[PDB]
């Protein structure tokens, strides 16, 4: 930092000095002087360097070992009180040399005058309300005071208020008045309220504190600006934006939503394609991000939860304002030099070319504290001196000197050139941090950092509320047909319903999905929910595709039965009894009513239960069934996921490939294979699945890992020639595969292209990706975990609970165990072979149009089909009594297993010791 303003010199008695470059004295303002961390032995070296500079008046060059005597350079530091969090105490050996001055807040009453001067300044644009300069200021000050007392650090660690918030509010009020239309008192009050919302209540967490701030705003307005014509001051009730008009005026909600939709469609088309649904919170946050990006040093920190839309929302808002989006393409083996080069390129584009970039820094786009320090230096100043120093400085000053000449402005001094450079960076570079969970150590360090927290506008997206989920679901379940279930409006409590009052099956579906998501997060997740619905969206998409597929299947079966009935009605003595056995047209009416319920259960099972135990799956399935029963949607009472989704052929293929006989493993494999809209993440301690998948894909399987050096290239081959990829490690993850984890491709005429690192590679279309992990203890990045279909292949303790049953019933009721398996086995093979015989009969009738000798085979097969009809009826009648007895018999051996699992837990604890 000193290299720009200091000039090393040499003298015989004056071995190298480091004085001013100019003739003016130099004052080193070291802000946050007590912030740097201290070594493990308890000594922070930067403070000792400062003491050396103030006591010894010099230091030692580390390459050359020469005493450098600083000349007429002064040291002025600034520090928060040591009692503040993160403030390391400073040694008395350093502060012994410095005069300490305490600067408190300006008394709380002087703030009134200090900002009344600002309001008198900014009301020169609107003289008609000159007399309102004094009220506003007091109100503003009062607001600040209240927000300082209500929202303390005890609630949230980022609830730090200061007069800087008041200055931001005054600048916002001016920059809305300056570019706004002719104003009225109601308009000014609403404008001030909007700016107050954006300054004080953006960082607030939870609807309780937002409502508290809203009532505080109402009280302040009624106390200091007792106007009589005002609307609702809620966050979504007032919307100020210059996207529609050329001014900055409060816009109607409907026009804003229509414009946002018609622009978002174009953005999804011409830019990267991600099918997305527009809702009210999206519009509000688009306005917030637009306001932040519009100002000069507009940096934002979006603290939400994964899969909320923050990154793509920032990209959309940048595209609206014509900002070049730059995202650091870093990976696991990316060091500080790569980040420095990326920042250098971004700065060069920002200044030497006036590119107006928008650097989106994710939480995972920083790996060590050096990246965060680079962000601090870039944000606190408007430049990073460490990038441009030494000879690289000499080039920069050259590139400035040419460039500043091309703009028609003359600047020959180095200081003037660098000041123009800093100003261009400040007014052209916007940094938008996006962090998923703020309780993580990296994200907590990002938030608590002084430069970021003081320069960035903390916008707390948070997780989706029930209104946003209802809007998204309504816009997502409006594509699939539901004109066959014959829904009847059910009687439910007003608290249970989330969308508009239930009048159709679609509202019931969205209510069930929202309620199950809430219950699932209530059971699995504890305390606060830093997880935004990615399960909800994936479940909605799965339900859409599954309803479509199941209705197509039902249509095909109905068509087959109807054409068979028509053929039989066209048809010599026993076919009248196949008129009876074609009563399945009556069964179709019952099985079509339960189609939506079965599809909901199967989609929820595919999405949520991938990473659950054998008992958690049962409990949450019971919860989902009681939720379906709470509303008026029906489902197959004896529903089995394996029977419903996977067919016999696929199950036999999986068993042949090497999969176990467990129902848990069959369900896990069904989840892995059936759901291929998202990458599957197979977790298993034994690697027995890695071979199984390979056995499924023969010679096409390619095994990689995130540890080997050539992996980055090898995938680029497998991704270009269509070979199934299994990555042996998943706990590690280099974000270069990021554009592959989320299906975010660059389409063209007929070639689909994906960006990996900085290479664009063509996707064959035969390429699958399975991520595989071994240790369940290992963690996966929040970006990966919420995008990927996590499937647990572990053999938990609860696997004992069922397994001993299959032993007990084997040696306690041998005949009952024998009938249990063959009941379902014969049932399934009957549902296949009766259809087989029906199409046999149909094609035989096709071949028996007018012959007589051929009818003997027709008659004998007609008599045959009666046998399987009797067996089907007998099996159904026997099951009607077997299932009650089976469920009665389950509970006894469940009692046995309750002790068995405890015993095994104790044994495993012993083994752990």
């Amino acid at each position: 930092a000193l290299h720009r303003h200091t000039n090393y010199v040499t003298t015989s008695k004056g071995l190298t000095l480091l004085p001013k470059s100019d003739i003016k004295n130099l004052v080193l303002f070291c802000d946050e002087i007590n912030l740097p961390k201290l070594d493990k032995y308890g000594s922070q070296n930067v403070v000792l360097f400062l003491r050396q500079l103030m006591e010894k008046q010099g230091f030692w060059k580390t390459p050359e070992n020469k005493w450098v005597t600083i000349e007429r350079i002064h040291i002025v530091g600034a520090c928060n009180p040591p009692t503040d969090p993160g403030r390391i105490p400073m040694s008395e050996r350093f502060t012994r040399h410095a005069a300490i001055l305490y600067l408190g807040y300006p008394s709380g009453k002087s703030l009134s005058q200090i900002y009344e001067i600002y309001y008198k300044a900014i009301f020169k644009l609107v003289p008609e309300f000159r007399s309102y300069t004094e009220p506003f200021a007091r109100a503003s000050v009062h607001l600040y005071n209240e927000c300082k007392a209500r929202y303390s650090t005890g609630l949230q660690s980022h609830y730090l208020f200061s007069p800087r918030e008041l200055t931001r509010l005054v600048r916002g009020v001016y920059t809305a008045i300056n570019t706004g239309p002719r104003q009225t008192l109601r308009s000014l009050i609403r404008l001030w309220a909007y700016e107050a919302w954006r300054i004080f209540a953006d960082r607030l967490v939870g609807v309780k504190e937002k409502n508290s701030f809203e009532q505080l705003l109402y009280e302040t307005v009624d106390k200091y600006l007792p106007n009589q014509d005002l609307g609702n001051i809620s966050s979504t009730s007032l919307l100020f934006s210059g996207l529609l008009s050329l001014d900055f005026k409060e816009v109607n909600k409907t026009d804003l939503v229509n414009f946002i939709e018609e622009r978002f469609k174009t953005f999804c088309d011409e830019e990267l394609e991600v099918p997305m649904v527009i809702h009210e919170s999206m519009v509000d946050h688009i306005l917030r991000i637009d306001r932040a990006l519009k100002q000069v040093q507009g940096h934002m920190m979006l603290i939400g939860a994964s899969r909320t839309g923050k990154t793509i929302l920032t990209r959309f808002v940048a595209w609206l304002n014509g900002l070049k989006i730059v995202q650091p393409k870093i990976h696991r083996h990316s060091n500080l030099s790569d980040f420095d080069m990326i920042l250098k390129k971004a700065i060069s584009d920002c200044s030497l070319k006036e590119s107006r970039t928008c650097l989106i820094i994710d939480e995972s786009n920083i790996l060590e504290t050096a990246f965060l320090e680079r962000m601090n230096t870039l944000l606190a100043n408007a430049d990073i001196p460490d990038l441009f120093q030494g000879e690289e400085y000499d080039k920069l000053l050259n590139n400035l000197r040419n460039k500043t000449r091309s703009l028609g402005l003359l600047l020959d001094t180095e200081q003037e050139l660098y000041d123009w450079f800093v100003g261009e960076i400040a007014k052209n570079l916007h940094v938008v941090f996006t962090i998923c969970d703020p309780t993580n150590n990296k994200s907590s360090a990002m938030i608590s950092s002084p430069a970021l927290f003081n320069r960035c506008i903390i916008n707390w997206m948070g997780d989706w509320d029930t209104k946003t989920m209802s809007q998204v679901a309504n816009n997502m379940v409006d594509v699939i047909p539901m004109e066959f279930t014959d829904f009847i409006v059910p009687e439910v409590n007003k608290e249970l319903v989330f969308t508009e009052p239930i009048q159709t099956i679609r509202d019931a579906v969205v209510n069930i999905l929202i309620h199950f998501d809430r219950n699932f997060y209530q059971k699995m997740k504890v305390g606060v929910n830093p997880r935004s619905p990615g399960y909800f969206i994936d479940g909605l998409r799965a339900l859409v595709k599954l309803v479509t597929a199941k209705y197509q299947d039902l249509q095909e079966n109905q068509r087959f039965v109807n054409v068979g009935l028509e053929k039989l009605n066209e048809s010599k003595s026993l076919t009248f009894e196949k008129e009876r056995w074609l009563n399945t047209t009556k069964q179709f009416s019952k099985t079509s009513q339960e189609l939506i319920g079965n599809c909901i259960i199967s989609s929820i099972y595919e999405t949520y239960f991938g990473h659950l135990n054998e008992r958690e799956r049962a409990d949450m399935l019971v919860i989902l069934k009681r939720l379906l029963g709470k509303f008026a949607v029906k489902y197959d009472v004896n529903y089995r996921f394996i029977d419903y989704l996977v067919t016999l052929d696929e199950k036999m293929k999986w068993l042949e490939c090497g999969l176990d006989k467990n129902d848990y493993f069959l369900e896990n494999m069904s989840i892995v294979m059936n759901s291929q809209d998202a990458v599957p993440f197979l977790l298993d301690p034994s690697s027995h699945m890695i071979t199984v998948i390979s056995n499924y894909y023969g010679n096409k399987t390619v095994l990689l890992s995130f540890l080997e050096e050539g992996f980055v290239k090898r995938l680029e081959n497998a991704i270009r020639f269509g070979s199934v990829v299994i990555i042996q490690d998943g706990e590690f993850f280099d974000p270069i595969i990021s554009r592959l984890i989320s299906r975010e491709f660059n389409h063209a005429g007929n070639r689909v292209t994906v960006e990996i690192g900085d290479h664009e590679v063509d996707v064959s279309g035969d390429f699958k990706l399975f991520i595989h992990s071994c240790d369940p203890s290992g963690d996966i990045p929040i970006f990966l975990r919420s995008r990927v279909r996590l499937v647990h292949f572990v053999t938990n303790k609860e696997s004992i609970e069922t397994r001993i049953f299959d032993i007990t019933l084997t040696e306690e009721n041998a005949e009952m165990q024998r009938k249990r398996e063959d009941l379902i086995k014969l049932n399934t093979e009957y549902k296949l072979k009766l259809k087989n015989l029906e199409k046999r009969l149909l094609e035989e009738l096709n071949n028996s149009q007018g012959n007589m000798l051929e009818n003997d085979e027709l008659m004998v097969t007609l008599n045959n089909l009666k046998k399987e009809a009797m067996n089907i009826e007998k099996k159904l009648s026997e099951s009607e009594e077997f299932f009650p007895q089976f469920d009665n018999l389950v509970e006894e051996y469940s009692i046995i297993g309750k002790h068995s699992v405890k015993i095994f837990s104790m044994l495993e604890k012993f083994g752990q010791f």
Partner: protein, 306 residues
């Protein structure tokens, strides 16, 4: 205008540019109406306007078939399966057919089969681009040469080319998984064969060069040690002479890959490395025989003992 539009219809497809074609079609549309009614009543103006409207009706098709992925094989398939005719091979292989043929193919209707064949065209070009990149890289690769005290030439930076050869071999292996590999098999197989031979020569060469450097410090410099081991140094001098001739003839080629065509190169390097390993074993046995006579030499090592 009729002469101009007839001339623009006869330009070879290998030279047609859509950017100027758009302006030319705009001019044709502008100048169609200004023709007098004598042209309008005749078939000349009607045919001209119909052909101009045919050209302007499809413009995505023209730019898609202007892509580099298209090849004479694809043009032959398009002509045979859509145009129902055969194109002269000289007219086809150079893509010099006129725009009238493109009109004949009737891009408006057969666009579904057109896109079906173009998709195959881009995938085959995905394979061909990797093949061309590998060939271009290995037609310009060369070692980095230095000269030490002796007249021998030494290679530096083995990795920058060894890793490239290994990665290219892995790429050529992985190309077999692609469905559209059959047409490119006859070239990929030969390229893989050449790269395997080059990789074997590289593996022998790095070891030969390393062992020769290691032994040059021991033998060939100190006269005393060569006197204690006359057979070893006598063999070493002949090895150095043969290696010098081999390396001079090898770097007289300006390309790394062409060493696979040098007569008796890989076997020569195998013999050289075998003889160097035998000389190293002889040194080890001599040093151990010296240490077993005065065992305190076990506290010194090899360089000190030498």
């Amino acid at each position: 205008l009729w002469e101009d539009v007839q001339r623009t219809f006869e330009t070879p497809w290998c030279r047609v540019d859509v950017l100027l074609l758009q302006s030319d079609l705009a001019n044709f549309l502008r100048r169609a109406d200004e023709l007098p009614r004598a042209v309008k009543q005749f078939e000349m103006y009607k045919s001209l306007f119909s052909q101009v409207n045919m050209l302007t009706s499809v413009n995505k098709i023209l730019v898609e078939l202007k892509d580099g992925a298209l090849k004479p094989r694809h043009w032959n398939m398009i002509f045979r399966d859509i145009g129902k005719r055969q194109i002269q091979k000289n007219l086809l292989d150079k893509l010099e057919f006129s725009l009238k043929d493109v009109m004949v193919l009737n891009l408006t209707l057969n666009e579904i089969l057109l896109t079906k064949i173009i998709e195959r065209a881009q995938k085959e070009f995905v394979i061909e681009k990797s093949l061309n990149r590998i060939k271009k890289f290995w037609k310009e690769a060369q070692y980095e040469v230095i000269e030490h005290s002796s007249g021998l030439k030494l290679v530096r930076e083995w990795d920058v080319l060894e890793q490239a050869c290994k990665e290219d071999l892995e790429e050529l292996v992985s190309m077999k998984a692609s469905n559209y590999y059959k047409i490119f098999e006859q070239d990929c197989l030969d390229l893989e064969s050449k790269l395997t031979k080059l990789s074997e020569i590289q593996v022998n060469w790095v070891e030969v060069q390393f062992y020769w450097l290691d032994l040059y410090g021991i033998l060939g410099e100190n006269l005393d040690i060569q006197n204690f081991l006359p057979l070893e140094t006598s063999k070493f001098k002949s090895l150095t002479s043969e290696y010098k001739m081999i390396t001079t003839r090898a770097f007289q080629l300006d390309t790394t890959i062409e060493v696979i065509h040098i007569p008796n190169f890989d076997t020569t390097l195998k013999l050289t490395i075998d003889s160097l390993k035998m000389i190293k074993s002889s040194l080890s046995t001599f040093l151990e025989r010296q240490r077993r006579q005065f065992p305190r030499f076990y506290f010194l090592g090899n360089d000190d003992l030498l």
